[PDB]
Symmetry: C7
Subunit: 287 residues, 7 copies
């Protein structure tokens, strides 16, 4: 409040301005060595206790009068405590710098004791900066079923420090944002043309009808509705040939499945594929 | 105590103020080079031994008189020891800075010997800052069964440096707070619409009745009471088809289960599902 | 706007230039100690509130007039908020430096409170610099199916901070660029002469016809069309001899396969190889 | 010793004070440029060799006279060697700073050569600070069977740098304290209401009597003495249904077991549970 | 261009040199406080806009005239953008330092905002320095089939930041050079006297003929051509004795195999070894 | 040698002291700007080439005269090379600081080029400081069979940088000391009351005699000589009940076994336990 | 060359010394503000282009005249390029410091742009310092078959940055030296009294003859020649008792085996042990 707090803050620096310092030129060691360390030494000592009144009138204005603020009560009552040590740290650290008493000895205990809280606020401040860069980069939105670190889930909320995303067990995970600027984000809702990589083991003991099984499965997959063909072709090749079988890794490429249309297709592709395998008189394998 | 400690602290700087320095202008090298290094050199040397009396009268006022303080006795008796080296470090480090003796040689052994304890207090101070950010971000409360790093447990206490949460074995884990600003917090009590991902292997050898099993299991799951349907549909599709079977991954989505209502449902969904499988004359699979 | 914002910015420094400071030589402590801390103290205090008008007229010029800018609306409305704390930080940090009030006490809270955001912007700024080095080094292009960390996918987009590459499940992964300057990038589209490393177990119980199987498989592989021979020779040697079998690790080297020509060859090489094995009357092994 | 060491330390600075410097005002370059670099250059050079006598009279006073000190002999004989390089480093680093010879060139080899031992003492000093924070935070006491990193053991000793805790093999592990401020501490002796999570596979082939087995096991567990019921209910639900069986995950919640009362209960709960399973005519499963 | 760009760069500092500053000694605050902050303040302000013309005439000289330079077009068009912010950063950061306006407030936003890009360019600059040390240390050449981190491949190219090496699947891996100064490089082409470590399980049930099998296999291996014997002897000892067998770990040491001469030997050593095992009437084991 | 090296070192600074500088007051720019940059500029330039003679007379005094020193020859011949670049670095870095030529430009290439070797000597200097803290903390002695990181072995030697401990294969491991201040040290020779955690599977199919087996095994273990009972009781409970068996985890607590008395007890406890199991007519299990 | 390069380097500073600066006292702003910024500004500007001639006459003296130097040609031709940017960096960084133009703005772009290459040369310079500490600590020699990180091999070469050691596959691994000051070095050639830890499963079904098997195996092992007994006794105890067997972990301690004497003993100890087992009529186990 710039209309009601400057009275003991600024009127008591107009006081020490006029009463003792400016009007009075008393020659008993008060000009050469006290005119500068008691104006700047007293502007600061009554600008720190300006900011203490501008700060602790967020006690009167925000929590006492308004209904606990735009924060909560326990959030703002420890904010009028962690901003009262960062105001005493700048208060003693600037009031000792202007009074000339121990200038570069309190600045080195408060520039090193204040870089201790910069070595240590690399996690919470890294989350603030990475969550500040998620607003520019935009990897996801409020519905995208992303995954950072096997943290598959749809994004509930996007905060500054932590985005909360609702897990595969429908548990609201609260991912810190520094896991988004240092890790892979597999965004799974801005995804068109999804894919199948299934595998069917099959007991042949023939090893020569199997290019016709591998041809007719491809002829199933490219003559399938809701299958995308502009990207990679539907592949069905064999691998892992053993004493009795050869497992065919069926691959296909769907188009914009909605997760209940998806599993009907991942079911019916594999079932129709097994129908084509049983058409050639060969049963399925033991793995 | 600003009413009873300034006597040998501040009366002996009013002493060296008036007796030797201010009133006396003795010309034998006492003004050009001793007026400033013995006022600021003696304000500081009797402000450090002010803070030593304000500090060691927390011995008389807190532990000797009051019942061992708001800390314990062994907490505050090593606090009147770790604050007596941070007062001798600022005492020699400011008393050597005002006396001009070795200014930037003690400041570089105490600004580097004091950043050794800032390289090293990145764990305990990181826990203080991350536990100070848990008050603003609020990932959990005193009942939330969260997990940070396979550290599943309900939160007993929320401290500055370590929140203690009671484990799955009902052992009170004491998680440091820097595991909350750098890691995922799967908060499991602000969770509505929980889910089932079960799997049922089933020996068919038919592979063509199985869309009717996969349809009738879905018709069980969406006609089930206490099952949420506004989010993802109850899915029952097959995967991993082999020589004799196909395992059906039954998925469902419950609503706000209370962990004893939960397992009755995760039991009866799977039992009723097996009843529907045995209705179609197919038994369960070998995995 | 250098034609319409300097009026209250620069005309009110020509004001305090001429009106009070330059023309007026009033001897009541206004020259020795106020001529420099109120010109540079007021150039800066009306150059910060120049840049506040040049900055908040990107509100009028970019989002209000033009259609939300070359950024979006929510991108530029938090850019006129994160550039208004970096202008108040340089505003108080330079306005306190020119006014001489607490010079090296606000510079040490803003050079340490501004290196807190340099300890912490090592992820987002590391992504900017590594994505700035991807433009010079060029590991990949817009079609290259690269992989950084089991992150196999063709590159959709190449941004500053994150390149997005479409995964093996055709999910648009959004890889941060610092995973490209610190990790291996297996670029799989600037690849000629691809290879096969297959394995065929085979029940012999002879262990002496097997150099003729290993010779005739090599004679298959080097007399194969679309097989590259200028690099490593097509090898077929045995390993892992056991109670009944010896698995032959067939290796070959193809030439510039197009991923649907590829698996036809990886099929027919192994099938023709099994035809050569069954020509020598030995069946395949149990692994 | 402030009564017997100042003789060659301080009497030879009263010597160079009176004999050559203070009383003598010889005009051959001895006042303008030698009065300050040979008082502060000789106070320091006879305050370093004060601290060398106060330091090496811990040789006479502590190890030679007293029985090897409160440390050992090999501890204090290398402490009068690592404090004689930190006194020669501050001795040359302050004696070169007061003599003006190479001020900011020895301070930059001793403020950088002394931050080499601050980059490197982040492990031992991190253990000192984290073990100094274990006195305030108090995660455990001298009997608590804690575990930090699969380091299960009861705490023998709690030092500054390393707490030693006696392992599960009854080997005295010596955990560094920085593993307590950066890692989870599962304190297992301030634990009330311990739990059972057992599993019983059981060959049913019925799948319809099993809600009565799951009801009667719960009726065993809540009608059990020394079982806590104010927290989570005793659950017995099925999971992992397969070709012949369904494994029932029996859970229960005991009360303050003393590790030999515990395993009698974890035995008799599972035995009585198997008695209830064999009461319903179904045998146990194959897993 | 030092023959055609200094005209508006340097002729307009000879202008402000002669016209206003040097020849003119106008006494209206232009000598005591403007002679130094407007020569060095205007040398710099017309040396930055010298380097802007020397820089943006790499636009005219390199890309517009010559065919897109020794870089590409998109490489050099973002190089005339990332060198125009490092010239505006040094331009405002030196032009504000010479004009005296906010000296140590812009230097602390540009020495800390420029060490943000030194905390962050530790990956790309680490690759430049480690790839600059690969030229001195020389771990490999353009044909060496090295491996850093299971990154087996022959080295295609050796760049500054990334050496590209063609993988075991003949995919051109692009390894960053900091994986060569911090990790093991198994250089496999400057390798003489390669080795075999094979294993043969063998069903004996005798356990007493086996020193003669282990002697005759060694007599095979040292009487083998292309086998090196100056280093370690060819060993054949048993290990892992079980119910029926004992697996003999045959070791040998070849000489400078060329990868197709190699596998013929690794085949024929094991085949001849099995011939010696079948000579003693014992068949091979089950593992 | 302070009796024979100061002749060209210190006599040539008494030379430039008296001959040119002190006695001669020649007014041709030799007092205002050359009296200080050529005394301190020549004290240093003949104190660096004092330390070069005090350093390279460790060539004459230590290796040439004495038998290669208390180090070896190859140790001290590279110590008169790595101390001749740290003397040229302080020689040019202080000789350029006193001569005033480029003071803060060589100090910033030698305070940053000398903190490059402080970023990098965090491993070797961390080993020196952690091995300097092993002398105070004392985790082990010269016979203690400790383990740091699955590095089980008895400690042969305890150096400054690396303690060498003889492995479980009796290979002298050379552990760096920074693995002792950052990792767990399971000291296994200051261990009293060792333990057994054995397991016996046993085919019962009774599940009701097994509290008498679990009682009689405990009655064996507490009536056993050389078994400690003041700590945890000898436990024998069952776990992992399956189709036919229940494995009993026998635990016991021995007393100060000497590793050949140990395994006789770990043998005879399990054998006597199996005798008690076969007394109750039940054989051992399949696991 | 201090006899032929100082002509344009030093004769053109004797030129600007005598011709314009020293002899000429022209009063047109050439003494107060140009006498110091153009002597030190021109000593440096003709000492940098002294070192450019002393540097680029390693082009004439080393590679052009001598046969490509003690380095190679490609090593020294990029050394006359990476020392020509560290001479232009110190050239502009000191020439801008003496000319006074932008002193603390180029020093902060070259003390921060030169600590970017100190954040980044922590790998190559860490290898130089750790390989410089391998000369003092001496963990190994040129024949020692050491292992750092499963990097078993005999040491071929010991460089500054990387020691190359020939692998178990006889591939010359090139280990960086920072893997020796931060990791365990199991030096396996300064090893006396090697050991055996073998295991023999054995089908007993007796469980009472087995102390006589465990006694007679020990009587074999201590009555064995080339077996060391001054350290740990030869142990043979049982563990892992199951349905039919008990595996006896035979341990022994050999003496200074030479790797072909070794495996004959590790063979014959196990064979003789199996002979003693078959003497007691019990066959070997199934594991």
């Amino acid at each position: 409040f710039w209309g009601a707090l400057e009275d003991p803050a600024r009127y008591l620096v107009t006081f020490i301005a006029f009463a003792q310092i400016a009007a009075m030129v008393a020659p008993t060691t008060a000009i050469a060595q006290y005119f500068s360390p008691t104006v700047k030494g007293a502007v600061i000592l009554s600008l720190v206790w300006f900011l203490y009144r501008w700060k602790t009138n967020v006690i009167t204005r925000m929590l006492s009068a308004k209904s606990f603020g735009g924060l909560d009560r326990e959030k703002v009552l420890t904010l009028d405590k962690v901003s009262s040590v960062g105001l005493f740290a700048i208060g003693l650290m600037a009031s000792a710098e202007a009074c000339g008493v121990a200038v570069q000895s309190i600045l080195t205990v408060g520039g090193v004791g204040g870089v201790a809280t910069a070595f240590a606020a690399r996690d919470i401040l890294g989350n603030v900066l990475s969550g500040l860069s998620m607003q520019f980069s935009r990897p996801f939105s409020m519905g995208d079923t992303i995954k950072a670190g096997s943290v598959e889930g749809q994004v509930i909320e996007m905060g500054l420090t932590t985005t909360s995303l609702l897990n595969a067990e429908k548990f609201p995970v609260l991912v810190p944002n520094s896991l988004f600027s240092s890790q892979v984000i597999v965004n799974k809702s801005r995804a068109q043309w999804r894919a199948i990589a299934s595998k069917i083991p099959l007991q042949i003991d023939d090893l020569d009808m199997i290019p016709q099984i591998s041809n007719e499965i491809k002829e199933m997959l490219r003559s399938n509705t809701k299958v995308f063909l502009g990207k990679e072709a539907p592949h069905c090749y064999l691998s892992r040939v053993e004493k009795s079988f050869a497992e065919l890794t069926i691959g296909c490429n769907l188009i914009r499945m909605g997760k209940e249309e998806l599993y009907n297709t991942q079911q019916e592709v594999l079932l129709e594929a097994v129908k084509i395998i049983k058409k050639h008189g060969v049963s399925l394998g033991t793995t």
